[PDB]
């Protein structure tokens, strides 16, 4: 389903929520994947940590200062690595007069203030922090241990590990797909909202074509230059060039799911914390095999997946004759139980 490819929101009951791989198959069966991004609001009784007041001494080893260059909706983000700091040190900076969220009536106002000021007063993003804020006993939707078919990488051979994102106002993530065109889970533990922009995978190539036209020097240097996660394109720029996209705001205690080859970027409203990781379903294997990778980085040997799930195609794929065409609208084989 999902004909217009719009971002869908789900409210699973505690029973539906219990199985992660089953629910993903469920949301795929409802066409959630067509948007490239879906929101999952978990049961009201469900909590992964009783309190976030015990993490002030937690170390952010490589905070990055985000320097943005550009104009006319077109930007490049340069990351400057800064010395290690604590969550206590970070929160103090985030909430300071120099870095705090401006006063705003509505989101459209905050969005406009972001697109107008992202080049000034560079913020610090306490991104890519190895760790989890989930309590060990928490079995439902545990980012640390999702136990998807992706775990085969580690089982046989940090993509499968959790990462925390301590954000402040204006810190942002550039347009990108997941490494190896994998899926992603992103839980916002606490704090101020996280706004998201998404392009449906079926229009993924249009955005690429548009970026290739805007940064031809970057495109001549690298086939998959968007993977560098440095390109920022404003919603107005996308609308001007007729690129279909959708937007959504993630609030604390909500989950966002990025689907294979579903381009996304966004920004933080203020001081917050988000944990994320990559995962996979049987549908991903074909995206993993066909993924255009950074030539100038995260690379996964597909051989193990093709052995187990496509042994009949192993010889044809190892010969370079696997001419399989991907249908971005087809749900995962695991969704059969719902069709
Ligand atoms: O809100 C967001 N903020 C920031 N980023 C976001 C985001 N993505 C962030 C990543 C990077 C993930 N990860 C990559 C690898 C890196 C360590 C590394 C490197 C090489 C090798 Cl070979 C082994 C390990 C650590 C980091 C991918 N998507 N998606 C959605 C939302 C957000
Ligand atoms: Zn991502
Ligand atoms: Zn590259």
From Swiss-Prot:
Fe cation binds at residues 176, 178, 264. It is found in: Nucleus. This is Lysine-specific demethylase 4A. Interacts with histone deacetylase proteins HDAC1, HDAC2 and HDAC3. Interacts with RB and NCOR1. Interacts with VRK1. Interacts with FBXO22; this interaction promotes KDM4A ubiquitination. Residues 135-296 form the JmjC domain. It comes from Homo sapiens (Human). Changing residue 158 to A: Abolishes histone demethylase activity. Ubiquitous. The chain holds residues 8 to 354 of 1064 of the full protein. 2-oxoglutarate binds at residues 125, 186, 194, 229. Histone demethylase that specifically demethylates 'Lys-9' and 'Lys-36' residues of histone H3, thereby playing a central role in histone code. Does not demethylate histone H3 'Lys-4', H3 'Lys-27' nor H4 'Lys-20'. Demethylates trimethylated H3 'Lys-9' and H3 'Lys-36' residue, while it has no activity on mono- and dimethylated residues. Demethylation of Lys residue generates formaldehyde and succinate. Participates in transcriptional repression of ASCL2 and E2F-responsive promoters via the recruitment of histone deacetylases and NCOR1, respectively. Ubiquitinated by RNF8 and RNF168 following DNA damage, leading to its degradation. Degradation promotes accessibility of H4K20me2 mark for DNA repair protein TP53BP1, which is then recruited. Also ubiquitinated by the SCF(FBXO22) complex; leading to proteasomal degradation. It comes from the Eukaryota. Residues 7-49 form the JmjN domain. Zn(2+) binds at residues 222, 228, 294, 296. The gene is KDM4A.
């Amino acid at each position: 389903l999902n004909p217009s490819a719009r971002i869908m929101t789900f409210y699973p009951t505690m029973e539906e929520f219990r199985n992660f791989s089953r629910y993903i198959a469920y949301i795929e069966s409802q066409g959630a994947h067509r948007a490239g991004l879906a929101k999952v609001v978990p049961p009201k009784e469900w909590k992964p940590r009783a309190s976030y007041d015990d993490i002030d001494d937690l170390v952010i080893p490589a905070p990055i200062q985000q320097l943005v260059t550009g104009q006319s909706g077109l930007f490049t983000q340069y990351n400057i690595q800064k010395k290690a700091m604590t969550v206590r040190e970070f929160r103090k900076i985030a909430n300071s007069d120099k870095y705090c969220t401006p006063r705003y009536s509505e989101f459209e106002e905050l969005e406009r203030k972001y697109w107008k000021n992202l080049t000034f007063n560079p913020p610090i993003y306490g991104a890519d922090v190895n760790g989890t804020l989930y309590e060990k006993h928490v079995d439902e939707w545990n980012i640390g241990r999702l136990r998807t078919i992706l775990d085969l990488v580690e089982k046989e051979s940090g993509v499968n590990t959790p990462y925390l994102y301590f954000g402040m106002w204006k810190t942002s993530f550039a347009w990108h797909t997941e490494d190896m065109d994998l899926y992603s889970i992103n839980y916002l533990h606490f704090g101020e909202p996280k706004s998201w922009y998404s392009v449906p995978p079926e229009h993924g190539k249009r955005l690429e074509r548009l970026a290739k036209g805007f940064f031809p020097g970057s495109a001549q240097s690298c086939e998959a230059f968007l993977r560098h996660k440095m390109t920022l394109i404003s919603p107005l720029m996308l609308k001007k060039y007729g690129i279909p996209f959708d937007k959504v705001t993630q609030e604390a205690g909500e989950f966002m799911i990025t689907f294979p080859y579903g381009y996304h970027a966004g920004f933080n409203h203020g001081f917050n914390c988000a944990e994320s990781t990559n995962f996979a379903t049987r549908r991903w294997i074909e995206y993993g095999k066909q993924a255009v990778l950074c030539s100038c980085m995260v690379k996964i040997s597909m051989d193990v997946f093709v052995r187990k799930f496509q042994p009949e195609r192993y010889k044809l794929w190892k010969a370079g004759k696997d001419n399989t065409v991907i249908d971005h609208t087809l749900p995962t084989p695991e969704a059969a139980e719902f069709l």
